[PDB]
Paper text:
Carbapenem-resistance in [name] (KP) sequence type [name] is mediated by carbapenemases (e.g. KPC-2) and loss or modification of the major non-selective porins OmpK35 and [name]. However, porins play important physiological roles and facilitate both the influx of small hydrophilic solutes, including nutrients, and the efflux of toxic products across the otherwise impermeable Gram-negative outer membrane. The overall structures of OmpK35 and [name] display similar features to other general porins, a trimeric architecture composed of 16-stranded β-barrels. L3 is not exposed at the cell surface but folds back into the barrel, forming a constriction zone half way inside the channel that contributes to the permeability properties, such as size exclusion limit and ion selectivity of the pore.
The OmpK36ST258 structure can be superimposed on OmpK36WT with an rmsd of 0.43 Å over 340 Cα atoms. The structure revealed that the GD insertion in L3 of OmpK36ST258 resulted in an extended loop conformation that intrudes into the pore, at the constriction zone, which reduced the pore diameter by 26% (3.2 Å WT and 2.37 Å [name] diameter). For example, the MIC to Meropenem is 1 mg/L in ICC8001, 8 mg/L in ICC8003 (encoding OmpK35ST258) and 16 mg/L in ICC8002 (encoding OmpK36ST258) in strains expressing KPC-2. This demonstrates that the WT OmpK35 and [name] porins in ICC8001 allow sufficient periplasmic diffusion and bactericidal activity for this strain to remain below the Meropenem sensitivity breakpoint (2 mg/l), despite KPC-2 and OXA-48 mediated hydrolysis. While not diffusing into empty proteoliposomes, glucose (180 g/mol), the smallest carbohydrate tested, freely diffused across all [name] isoforms, demonstrating formation of functional pores. Meropenem (383 g/mol) diffusion was significantly reduced in OmpK36ST258-containing proteoliposomes compared with OmpK36WT. Diffusion of lactose was impaired in the presence of L3 GD in OmpK36WT+GD compared with OmpK36WT.
Residue numbers in the entry:
A (entry chain C): 0 to 184, 188 to 344
B (entry chain A): 0 to 185, 189 to 344
C (entry chain B): 0 to 344
Amino acid sequence: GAEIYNKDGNKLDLYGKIDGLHYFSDDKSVDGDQTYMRVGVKGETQINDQLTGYGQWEYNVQANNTESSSDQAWTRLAFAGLKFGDAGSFDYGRNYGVVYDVTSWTDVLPEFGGDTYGSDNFLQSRANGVATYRNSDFFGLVDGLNFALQYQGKNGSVSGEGATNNGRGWSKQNGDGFGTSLTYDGISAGFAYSHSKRTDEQNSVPALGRGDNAETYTGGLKYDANNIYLASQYTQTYNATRAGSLGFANKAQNFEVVAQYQFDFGLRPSVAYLQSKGKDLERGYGDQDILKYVDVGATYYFNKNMSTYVDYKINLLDDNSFTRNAGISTDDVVALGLVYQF
Amino acid sequence: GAEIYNKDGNKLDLYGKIDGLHYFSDDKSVDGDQTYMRVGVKGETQINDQLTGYGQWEYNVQANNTESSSDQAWTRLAFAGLKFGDAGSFDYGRNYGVVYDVTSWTDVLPEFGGDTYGSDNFLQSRANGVATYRNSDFFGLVDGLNFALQYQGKNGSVSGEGATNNGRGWSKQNGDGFGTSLTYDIISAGFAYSHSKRTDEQNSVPALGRGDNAETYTGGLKYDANNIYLASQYTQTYNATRAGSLGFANKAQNFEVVAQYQFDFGLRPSVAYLQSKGKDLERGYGDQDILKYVDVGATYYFNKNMSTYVDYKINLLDDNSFTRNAGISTDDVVALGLVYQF
Amino acid sequence: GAEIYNKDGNKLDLYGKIDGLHYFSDDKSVDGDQTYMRVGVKGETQINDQLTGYGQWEYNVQANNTESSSDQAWTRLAFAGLKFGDAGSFDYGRNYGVVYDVTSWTDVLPEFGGDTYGSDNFLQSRANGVATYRNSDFFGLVDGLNFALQYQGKNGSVSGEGATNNGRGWSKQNGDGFGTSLTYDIWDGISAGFAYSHSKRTDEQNSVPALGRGDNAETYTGGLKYDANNIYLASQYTQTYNATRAGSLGFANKAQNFEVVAQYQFDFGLRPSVAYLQSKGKDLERGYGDQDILKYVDVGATYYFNKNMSTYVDYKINLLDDNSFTRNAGISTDDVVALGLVYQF
Ligand SMILES: [Mg+2]
Ligand SMILES: [Mg+2]
Ligand SMILES: [Mg+2]
C-alpha cells in the first residue's frame, strides 16, 4: 500500500501488483502464459475523532491475452463503510464473505491453494451485495477476539421470476442469506457459519445437487510465530460446494493444511495438502473426490516490493467419469512467478 | 478530487467515489444490488501566463455483478482542451452536450432524477466527439454571463452506407449537429438549443419516430441561496427523446423541478417531480407518458468525503401497452446508499 | 510521467495521455471520432545497491464509443523484472518483442506509421508471454552497444489440440519462438541496429487463413537512425517469412517491409514530419503472386505547447489501389487526415 494522499482528514492508498506468471501443464486449458495485474485504492476519512469513513476498490486486469480479447478485467472488491470507536464497523458492497475470515488462514500458498471454494459462491469468498458488521477485540473488552455478522440479498437469474437487476448464471446465484464468524488468539482458532437460500434455477437446471439452503460450517487453526506458519481449515458444506460444471455437492467435506518457514535471507518454502470430498452425489456418482492435491512451492522475497516464486501442484485426482464430465483438472501444474508489488 | 501531483507546471487530481448501493423494487430488472464506483483524473498544465492545457477522464466501474460478467466498465468522459485567459476555452472528446449546461440544474436528487434524457442521446448528455467552445463572464466583461458553442460529427451505424468507425445502435446514433447554451447568474436563468441530423437507421429500424432532424429547446431557472436550492427545467424536443425501446417521440415535453434544504449539521432533504410527455407516437400509441414520478429523499453529508442517502421514487406511470412494449418501469423504487468520495 | 510516490525505496510513476482525436476519411470504417486515453504505472524498487526490481502496466481505454459498447479497454504492457547492475536485466510478461528494438526507430509519426507489422504479431511488437534479457553497454565494457535475447512460449488456439489457456485467433497466435536484437550508437547521433526472430507457427495458422503456409515465421531487420541537433532521421528494412499479415487473407509467405522518416524540431515547438512506408508481399497463393500490402506517404506536424500538451495534424496519402487483393483482405486504400489535441502526464 502506497500512501499517495494525506490531507485535510482524508487519506488515499494505492496498492497492487504485476505478476509475470507462467504455467506448465499437460492440461491445455491452464497451460501457458498467465500474466496479470491488480490495482486497488484504499481510502479513509476522519469524520470526527470517533467516526471514520472508508472505501476500498480492487480490480483484476488480465494481461495474458491480446488487445482484441474480451472480458479481461473485473472488480474483485468495492465497498464503503463506517467505523465508530469500539462499537464496530459496517460496510456494504462487493466484499469477502465472512467464511473467508477463517478459510483465508490456509490461502497462503505461492500460487495455488484456496480452491475448495470459489468466488461468487454464496458467502465463501468475494460476493456481491454483502452488508458486513464487524467488531475487533469485542468492544474493547477481550483482546484478540473478533466476530462478524453478514447479510446478503438475493442475486438471481438474468430473466424470469427469479430475476434481480444484476443477474448471473446458476453457479453464481444466491438467495437471501447470512453468515457469522468468530476468531480468537501465536495460536489462533476460528469458526464460521453461512446459510443462504438457494434459487429455483439452482434446484432445477444443474444435474447435481438439490436443497432449500446452501450451508457451510468451518473451523480453523493457525500458528504464526518464530518464522513458522502452520494453518488448517476444515469446512463441511451442504449444497454449497461446486461439483465442477455439474452443479453442487449435496454434501462435501473440505480440508486444507499448510506449513511454511521464513528464512531470514528471504526464501519461504511451503508444503500443503487440499482435499474436497463430495458425498451423496446423484447419478451414481456417490462419493467423489472434487479436489485433491499436494502443493510444494517456495517464494523468494527480495524485499517487500519484489518477489519470485515456484509452485508445484501435485494433482492426486484420478481421471474418471466424474472429473471428466465435471470438467475438473487432474493434471499437475508448475507455476513460475515474478511479482512486483506496491 | 485529491491533488496527487503538482510539479513543473503540471497538476493531477484523482477523484471518484465508491457507492455501496442497494435498490428495493417490485421490478425485477431494477431490484437488488447496485454497487458501483467512479474513478477519474483531471490534469492541468500552465503553458504560459494566459494559456493552460487540460485533460479529464472519467470511468464508471460496475461492481454489482460477478467476476465473470461482461461489459461492466465504461468511459463517461475523456477530453482534452485549451483555455486562454478571458478569450474562452476549447475542448474535444467525450464530453457533456451543452444542453446539460441547463438541465444539470435539476439533476441533484439523492439517487434518481436526470432521466428525461439519457447518455449518447444527441447533445443532451455525455456524447462522443463533441467540440465545445466556452466563454465565462463574457470575455471578462459581464460577470455571471456564460455561453457555449458546440459541434458534433456523425456517430453512425456499425456497417453499411451510414457507418463511422465508432458505430452503434440506432438509439445512440447521431448525424452532424450543433448546440448552444447561455446562462446568466442575474438566481440563474438558462437556455440551451441543439440541432442534429438524424440517421437513416433511426428513420427505418425502430417503430416510432420519423424526421430528418433532432432538435431540443430548453429553459431553466435556479435559486441557490440561504441554504435553499430550487430548480426547474423545461425541454421541448423533436425526434430526440427516446420512447423507451420502441424508438423516439416525434415530439416530447419534459419538465423537472426540485426543492432542497441544506441543514448546517449535514442533512439535505429533497423533493422533486419529473415527467416526459410524448406526443404523436405512431402505431396508435398517440400521446403517452414516457416518464412520470415524484421523488422524496435525503442525503446526510458526514463531511466532504463521506455521505449516505435514501431516495424514494414514487412512480406515477400507469402500466399500459406502451410502457409494457417499450420496457419502461412503472414500479416504485427505494435506494439506500453509502458513499466514500475522494 | 508523474512520480506520485517515492518512499522506503519504492517509487511509482503514473503516466498516460488523453487524446481528443478525429479522423477524416472516405473509408467509413476509419472515418470519425477516435478519442482515446492511455494510463499506466511504472514502478521501481531499489533492492540493494546493484539490484533493482521493477514492473510496468499500460492500459488503453477507448472513448469514441458509447457507454453500452463492448471491449473498449485493453492492456498493452504488463511485466515485472529485475536489473542486476551491469549483468543485465530480465523481465517477463506482456512486453515488446525485440524486433521492435529496431523498428521502433521509425515509429515516430504524429498519428500513423509503425504499421508494416501489428501487435500480437510474433515478436514484432507487443506480445504475450515474452521473457526478455537485456544488456546495455555490453556488461559496461563498450559504451553504446546494446543487445537483447528473448523467448516466447506458445500462445495457441482457443480449443482443441493446439490450445493454450490464453487462446486467440490465428492472426495473433504463435508457437515457441526466440528473437535477438543488437544496436550500436556509432558516434554523435548515428545509430545502427539489427534484429532477428524465429518462431514456430501453429496448426490454425496453416489451415484457417487463405494465404500463407510454413512451419516457421522468421524476421530479419536492419535499421539506421540519426538523432541530434533537433533533426530526427530513421529507416528500417525488414524481410519476413510467414510473419507479415496479408490483412484478413492470412500471412504473406514472404514480405519486404521498408519505413523511412524525417523530422525537424523547431525550438518554438513545431515538429514537421514526412515519412514513407511500404510492405510488399511475395509468393502469395491463390493467384495473388506479388502484392502491395501497405504503401503510403505521410506528411504531418505536431505542435508542442510544453511537455504536457500538444496538438497535431497527420495526413496519410494512401498509394494502394482498390483491387481484389485489398478488397478481399480488408485493407484500407483511402487517404486519412487526423486531428488531435493531447494532454499528457
Ligand atoms: Mg441436498
Ligand atoms: Mg417527427
Ligand atoms: Mg511459406
